[PDB]
Each structure stands twice: as structure tokens, then as C-alpha cells.
Symmetry: D2
Subunit: 313 residues, 4 copies
């Protein structure tokens, strides 16, 4: 089995995982760069699979026409419907949650509930989130548009931005560290960043863990579930090894591969029953929003528009 895999994700157990499959010739760059490279390659791309992170980036690839639909009984049986494209263009293989982090000292978790509630006036001066250009934020806002519509999402964004502790700066972990530094009290950031800190041998990172806690939002009655997003992949339009490409996707969905692929970046498998990293699992069961993740891409342009309209820098 041989394939040319273009991937914006690589951690290093991946190589034993890929070897077990066959020859996987890896091409690596950032997601936007790989999409553009494939675009440049016209009808002659040697790529079989594009693997990237965030349904918002899969949508950018999809928009550029990069994928061919595939029909695999195995992928359909195993991968939850809401974690794959309705037309079979791409499939999620890991998921992450965009959670809340809070100051243990300064925030009672009983006062937390939903993303939507962070627009409430009590959070004035307290909210930490990275810039609006980031695809994780584009996708969270996109999910809110899918759920609530544009007017309601605008009102939420207006409150949320109003409550910023500072103009967005830094990456997701920068928001977590900002709580510990006393700059703000509640941050929105992905789950796996906190697991990194917990696993760190750096005593400074343990200080952050001691001071800041993880809270899963939106798990109460009528709240839908925590926002989830995926890393995943689809078969490229002109894939020279189409059978092998589909076989690779099926392999990535296998119990063995799922377990250690998800471990790579402290993410959750997409396959139920596959063991979850113990440090991640100790935070509790993931109760994800059932929204089809294709909606994260669908409302990406509207999300950028609304976030910029209300002054989220």
C-alpha cells in the first residue's frame, strides 16, 4: 500500500502508525500552504490525501474543489455522522473541544455555564481569547450562527467582545497563562492545550495547572453540548492511488490506529470505545454538540464578517 499524504498535522508516533499501513510519503506544511500547493498542482497533483486540522480548514480545501467524494461502508459505520462531511468529501479522525479555563482562586465554576453566558455583564474585564483571524474562533462563532442565527450571534459577540480583559493577543496557551498571570479570569481555548501543561515537566507549567482549571461548557439541559471540532482528511480529486487512499482512511478509523493517533496531540478519538489519554479522560466524559461539523465551514465567511463588525481584533 503506498500513498502520498499531504498533512498539516504530524506528531511522532504517527510514523509507527503509518508504517503499519504501508508506505506513506509525507508532505508537510501549514494548512493554508498545503491547500495552495495543491491548487498550484492543477490536475497533476501527486497527492492522495489531504489531512488537516479544523473543519474550517477542511472547508477551505473543499471550497477550492480539492476533494473527491468517497463511499466507504467502513467509514460510514464507524465515524459518527456529525464528524464527517454529509457528501463524503472528508472525515474527522480526531476531535478536540473548545472549552473554558478559569481562575481557581477568582472564579467559582458554579458561575459558569455556556459560551453564550460569557456575554453576561458579570464577566466585564474578565474574558481572554486569541484574535478573530484564528480558525478555532472562526469555527466556534460559525457554530453559534448555525445554532442561533446571525442576529442573535451578533448580540452575543457584542457582549463577549465588551467583556474582553484585553484586546486579543497571543495563542491559545497564552490565554491560559494569562489567567495565571492575573490578566483575566476566564479564557476560551482548546482542551488539548491544558493537557500539554499537565504533562509538562516544567515546574512553571505545573504552576499554571495549579492556578487554572478546565470547565466543559454547554453540558446542561438544553445547551446542546460542548463545541467540538475535528482534524480529518479526504481523498484528493486526482489521487493517483485512490484504492490505497480509501484504505488509508479506513485504517485511520481502526481501533488500534485511533488510539495512538488521538494520543499524538492529546485529542479524543472519533470512534467510541477507543481508550482516551488518561490525563484527558480524568476531566470527564466529553459531551459534544451533535451539530454536523460541516456547519463550522459553512458559516465561516459570516463568522469572520460578524466578528470583525463587532470589533473582535
Amino acid at each position: 500500500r503506498t500513498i502520498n499524504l499531504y498533512s498539516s498535522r504530524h506528531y511522532n508516533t504517527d510514523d509507527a502508525l503509518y508504517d503499519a499501513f504501508g508506505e506513506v510519503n509525507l508532505i508537510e506544511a501549514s494548512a493554508e500552504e498545503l491547500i495552495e500547493r495543491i491548487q498550484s498542482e492543477g490536475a497533476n497533483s501527486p497527492g492522495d490525501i489531504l489531512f488537516t486540522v479544523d473543519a474550517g480548514m477542511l472547508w477551505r480545501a473543499e471550497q477550492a474543489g480539492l476533494f473527491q467524494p468517497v463511499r466507504s461502508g467502513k467509514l460510514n459505520e464507524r465515524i459518527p455522522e456529525n464528524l464527517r462531511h454529509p457528501d463524503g468529501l472528508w472525515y474527522g479522525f480526531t476531535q478536540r473541544a473548545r472549552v473554558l479555563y478559569y481562575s481557581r482562586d477568582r472564579v467559582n465554576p458554579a458561575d459558569l455555564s455556556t459560551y453564550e453566558a460569557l456575554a453576561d455583564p458579570q464577566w466585564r474585564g474578565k474574558i481572554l481569547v486569541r484574535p478573530s483571524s484564528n480558525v478555532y474562533n472562526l469555527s466556534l462563532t460559525a457554530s453559534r450562527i448555525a445554532i442561533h442565527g446571525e442576529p442573535e450571534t451578533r448580540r452575543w459577540l457584542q457582549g463577549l467582545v465588551g467583556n474582553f480583559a484585553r484586546q486579543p493577543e497571543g495563542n491559545d496557551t497564552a490565554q491560559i497563562r494569562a489567567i495565571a498571570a492575573g490578566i483575566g479570569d476566564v479564557a476560551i481555548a482548546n482542551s488539548y492545550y491544558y493537557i500539554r501543561l499537565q504533562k509538562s515537566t516544567d515546574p512553571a507549567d505545573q504552576e499554571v495547572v495549579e492556578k487554572v482549571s478546565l470547565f466543559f461548557p454547554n453540558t446542561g439541559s438544553g445547551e446542546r453540548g460542548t463545541h467540538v471540532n475535528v482534524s480529518g482528511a479526504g481523498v484528493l480529486k486526482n489521487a493517483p492511488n485512490r484504492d490505497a487512499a480509501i484504505a488509508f482512511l479506513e485504517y485511520l478509523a481502526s481501533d488500534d490506529a485511533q488510539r495512538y493517533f488521538a494520543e499524538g496531540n492529546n485529542e479524543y478519538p472519533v470512534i467510541p470505545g477507543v481508550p482516551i489519554d488518561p490525563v484527558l479522560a480524568a476531566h470527564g466524559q466529553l459531551k459534544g454538540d451533535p451539530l454536523n461539523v460541516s456547519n463550522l465551514g459553512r458559516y465561516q465567511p459570516d463568522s469572520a464578517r460578524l466578528m470583525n463588525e463587532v470589533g473582535w481584533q
Copy 2:
């Protein structure tokens, strides 16, 4: 035993460990610039950090604004480091420099039509300009430099024209803009110099295709223009540095010819010291003619830059 310091750096190239070992025992703490600033803030008045090294005068300024640096007075640093590549009050010092240049489609753009950042606001560039999001510090610093030079009203008008000429709403990183030219998405990108050097050095045929399709153009070097926009990576001694003398000694060492040469090589950047050999691939693009603006201006007008870029709709 060796000189010792605690170096907090957002820059590391595998290639730097021998540079540091030659100095002494450099205990390296690494994280993104914003994270390091926040870590030091958390550590408070007894932080053991000796030096913060980071990339972009805009990041040094964020550190400065958090009150992280103490001023140092060093004859060697003053004599060697160009005055405009260090803070006027001795709070921090540039050790490498990069240029924010233009990239253009060889097939679709005639470089005679290029000149300055300012001219990219001309209506002929409608639907042609590629640049990454306004959140990025390299952009914040380029705009900050235009404010320093032209004032806010002029700079606002330039931003309006520039944004009006975007080929698409900003997405992806600097190299993504260069690749977007190759892919036919736009025709002129703004990105740093060293990203193109990476592509030239790459063994990947697809990277060589990009360098075949796109060329590097140094803007603002014409008669009566100031010079290309330059920015630095650099460092200062932290306010309550436990190893203050060693920290100053370390800054002096980083300014030495031996260290400058290979420190700059690490990321295909230019040394700040004149006469220190420049990477041959970078040097083949010609002599850097940098704007003499003191790089502290890049941080000084950072808030203004973020405000104006957002006002005009640079996403």
C-alpha cells in the same frame, strides 16, 4: 565553573546550542513570545529570568510595556549595534534583522511597476494584493512604521487603498502569501525576506516551483525613498535579573562577529553588525538598504496600528 544565565527565548534554532555553549551555561526556557511575557509577569518581582529574547520590535515593546526590562549601559553594545536597531533608553537591543519585502508573480507582474509599500494603494493593484491577517505582529510593525513616518491621516488613507486592493480576505501565514502568488490567487504579497530564502534552500520540487514563479523585490529603495522596512529579533536584561553582569556579558557576546554570523544564519536573517558575512543565498538578492527609523517606533505606534487596521477592515 561557567558563566550562567537564565535565557527566556521565543527563538530557537537547533543551530544555536553551540553558540550558547561557547558562552557558558545558558539555561533555556522556550515558549511563544506572549507566553514568555506572561510567564515572567506571573513570576513577579523575584523572577529568575536574566534575558528575554524575542522576535519583532513589537514583541519587545509588549515586554517593555509590562515593565520587564531594565536599562543597561554597555560600551560594546553601543559601539557595535547600529543606533536605530536598539532601544533609545538601552532597554533592549536588536541582534538580527529581517526585511518586510514584496513578492511578485514573475509571469504577471513587471517589477518596474513596483516601488514602495505606499504605491500598493494605487488602484491598479485592485484584486491583486496578498497579506496575512492584521493580528500578526509583522503587519502591526509595518503599519506602525508608516504611522511614525507619515502620520495617522496619511497612513489611514494608505491602509484603505491597500485593503481595497486585497486579492482575498487575509488568511494563512507569510509563506502562504508567497505560495498564493504561485497558485494564481493574487500577484503581489507582503512578507518577510527569510521565508523566501527557506523556499530557495528547500529540496522539495514544489518549493522550487514557487521560487521559479515568484521573485523577491526590495521596496522603498528608490531615490528619495527611506529604505526597506526592517525589523529585529532582539533581547534586553530583565528587571530583577539574578545574574546581571553575566546577562550583559551575554548580550555583548551575541553582538560579537563569531556569534552574529551564525545566529543570523539560523533563520536566514541579516546580522545587525556591518561586515559580518551574510548567508550567500540571502546575499545574492543584493545589499539590504534599510529604513534608518529607530525600531522602537515599531512598538510605539503598535496600538495605533491595530486600531487603524481594524477601523479600515483589514481582517
Copy 3:
């Protein structure tokens, strides 16, 4: 689950494999260095597990008194008896084969059979093997002493050395490349080195693969099987986390972990039925000698003595 793992083996999927278990604090050095470090640590070693490569090195650790015996129903059920110490002091977790490589152009594989036959006069000037100080060679010779006794092993060594293409020099892959360079015709080296070459993207390494083939010796009637050896581990005498240490050993013997742990260095799992790396598997079924691998250590001193007696440098 937390343990202090001293290991002379590390490949980088190991980290996702270890994370799935718990916190595995890794200490790494060469095998002899780790044994000596533990010796220095007296009754105060923080180590829970010593993992090392070659039953000959496990024996050196065992000789230094470093292990405590453990009794695990799971290890006993799953790990073949011949791949673990009879007294439960240590357990193999991967295996390798010490095979023959031959010049495709110059050697007909029909002329190959056993290690023992390489002492035959037809191999004069043709045999390539690394120096006698190497533990892989110590263990192969040790197995011959276990099987044939010392007098017969001496006669074999005398013929074998007589047939050397050159005085031993270089590592195992150096012997493989030496065939391709025309220096000799048959080399003795481990299986996984050739798999490395096959997986290499370097066109020079593919030239070696095109010129040199792998042959499993000793698989005919009455030949016992190919010489095998293991990488494995035991619980340290003063292990501070004994329950966790045993749990880690059991985890290393699990189907999931076995698959990708063996992939790390292109080795075979010790557990039957666990998928084997496809490039390795394409060479055929491994038919290993059933000799208990504790014998490889047991006769190590005699092996060094005999090899040096007959002039194997």
C-alpha cells in the same frame, strides 16, 4: 499510573504508547551505562523498570542483581515461555532474528542453510560479520554452545573465522553494505537493519536492497529455527512503584501496544497474532528457535572466551 523507566531503547512512537499508560518518566542511556547507573544507586534507585535490548544485556543486569522476580498471570499467559526468564526476572517484548544476507548476483540461496554450514570450505573469503565484542554475536555464539556444546561450537567458530572476507569491522549494516560493495558475499546481521534500508528514501540504500537479499537460516528439518533474540524488561529490586511497574509490563504485552512498539525498530511482536510491519512480514513467517533466551546470557562468558580463542576480532 506513574513509573520511572530506565531504557536503552527509544523510538518516537513510544511516547504516545507510554502516554496511553500514564506518566512514564524516561531515563535513557546505553545498556551498559544504565546497568552501571543502577548499580551506583545502591538500594536507593528510583527506577521501576529497566528495559534493554538483547537477552545478553538482560543477563548482565540480572548478574548485577538488578531485578526482582514478578509473577503476573497476564505476562505468563501472553508472553511465549521461551521469550522470558524462567524465574520471572525479565520478559521479552519484541524479538529480532539474526539472519543471513547474501549477494543476489554471486550467491544462490539454495546453497545457504544454517549458521553451522557457514563454516564449510565453500565460504572461504566470503563471510562478513561485525566484531566479537558485539552482544548480538555473543548471543548467537551462546545459542550455539547451548545447542551443540563447547567443543562443537569451537570447531564451528574455527571454520567460520577461517572463512572471513576480512577482519570484522563496522556495525551490522556495514556488513550488508559490504556485500553490495563486493567485499564479501554472505553476512550475518539482524533482520531489522535490512527493513531500514528497504524503507529508506535514499536511492543509495535502495541500491543495496536491489543487490543484497535476506535469507532466514536454520528453518529446514532438524535445524531448530532461526536464531531469535529479544528486547525486554524487568522490575528493579527496589522499585518504588511496584504495582505500576507490573501494570506497565502487562500494558507492553497488550495487543495495541505490541503492534506499534514492535514497529518502532522494525521488530516482531512477542505476542502471536499481533500485526507485523508489512515490509518485514513480506519476507515470510518467522520460524524461531524455541531455545529459552535466558541461555543467550548463560553462555555469554563461554561465548566471549571461545570467540577470542579462535581469533574472531
Copy 4:
């Protein structure tokens, strides 16, 4: 475009890539020394290798014996590289040097009792000496140097006494011998200088314990003794080098002060060029006083060394 060469090297420290980039396009092929020699042999008369760089004069000699090198005549190399650290016929050149020194138990050995390699054959060292197996090229080269200096009969007698004093049959690598002293297995080890520097620099408390328990002693520096045994890592231009002029230029570059400093740092070795700063941790052990023996002697008597070591039972 850049100068280009195909460098086959058995040495690489992450730390070298910036050193090579400063030169030009250095296409690096890496493998163990013996493997590289065999690869080049396989490639035959039209091998594209420009330079073979390897570690130990004994490995350069194996390359020489395979007829892999052409002689080069370079004024800069001749003027800069000490005559005794390069081949008399210009076939290859040392670029770093290491010393094969003694290590001793601080608690159990008084360094006044140490002097020369030769004295370790004295019966007082019975059951005390630690050294790695005779197959190892560092040992082959040390013994080869004694043959060059003393002749075979004297050297044989020295080997007999040395082997008779082994604390255990040789096992493990160089650092294993240093650790074996700490573990109480023996009291005096023979190993290279840079292995101890690694331990000193290590953040692992167990490594610091070894350096607390074991000290480095430079042998053969006494009155009327020749100097400590030194050996080199080094390179020559390959016989049918496609880029011959660039290859020579590359050797000249590796001998420059800038490159020497950090090339030596990579593995805690000494530069071959006098005046080039030495790593501070290494330098704190004192000035290297090397034996002036031409290092080509280390390869010249390699077969003799292997024969005599095996004859006397050094396993």
C-alpha cells in the same frame, strides 16, 4: 547560485547546519564511518562524493587504504592546520581534536600515583583498569601511537601488563568506563576527553554524581614525556570529486576561526587552530599538551595494533 559540494560525513551535530549554510549548499550524506567508506567504494570511479569527513585518524586511514582520497595542496590549510594534525601527503586534514585521557576515582585514587599510559601496566593497578573493547578505533589508535613511539616488543609488553590489570573484561562504550568507576567496578579508566564534558553539562543529577565521584587526568604531560595522546576528526577531498575547487574551499572554510570555534563546540572537542576559543567547561581542565606525533601514525600502525591487542587477550 551557491557553492555546492556533496559531503559524506559520519559526524553531525544539529549544531553544524548553520556552519554549512554559511558556506553554500552542502548536500549531506550521513552514515557510520565504515558504511560511508563502503558506500563510496560501491559508487566506484564516478562517485559524486566531494568530501569524506570522519572521526579518528584510524577511520581516515581506512578511507585512505580504500584509495578514496586525492591529495590537495592548499596554502591556507598548510599554514593554519598544525603539521602533525594532517596527513603528510595532503590526503586529509584534522579539523577538531580530542584527547584520550585517564579518569580516576576521587575517593580511591590519588592522582599523584598517575602519570602515563605506560605506567598503567605497573602491577599496582591489578584489578583496577577499565577500558572498552579492542575493536574500538579509539583504542586501536592509542595502541598504534604506542607502537609508533616505542616499537612492537615494548608495546606488546605494555599491553600485556595493561590487560593483566583489567578490572573486568572490556564491555560498554567510553562513558560506560567512566560510570564504572563511579559504580566501584574499577578505579582508573581510559576514555576520551569530551565524554566527561557531556556529563559535566548534563542536567541529570545522576550524571552530576559521576562527575562528583570521578576526575579527569591528562596523562603523559610530565617532564620528558611526550604529551597526551590526541586524535582528530577530519576530512579529505575524494578522488573523483565533481566539485573539486568547492571541496578545497570547503576544507579551507572549516579551518577558518569562525567555523573552527563552533565546529569544535559541537562535540566538546578542541579546535585544531591555536587561538580559537575553547569551550569554557573543557578549557577549565587546563591547556591541552598534545603529543607532537603525526596523527597519520595512528592509522599506519592500526593493523599492528589490532594484531597485538588480540594476541595479548584484550577482548
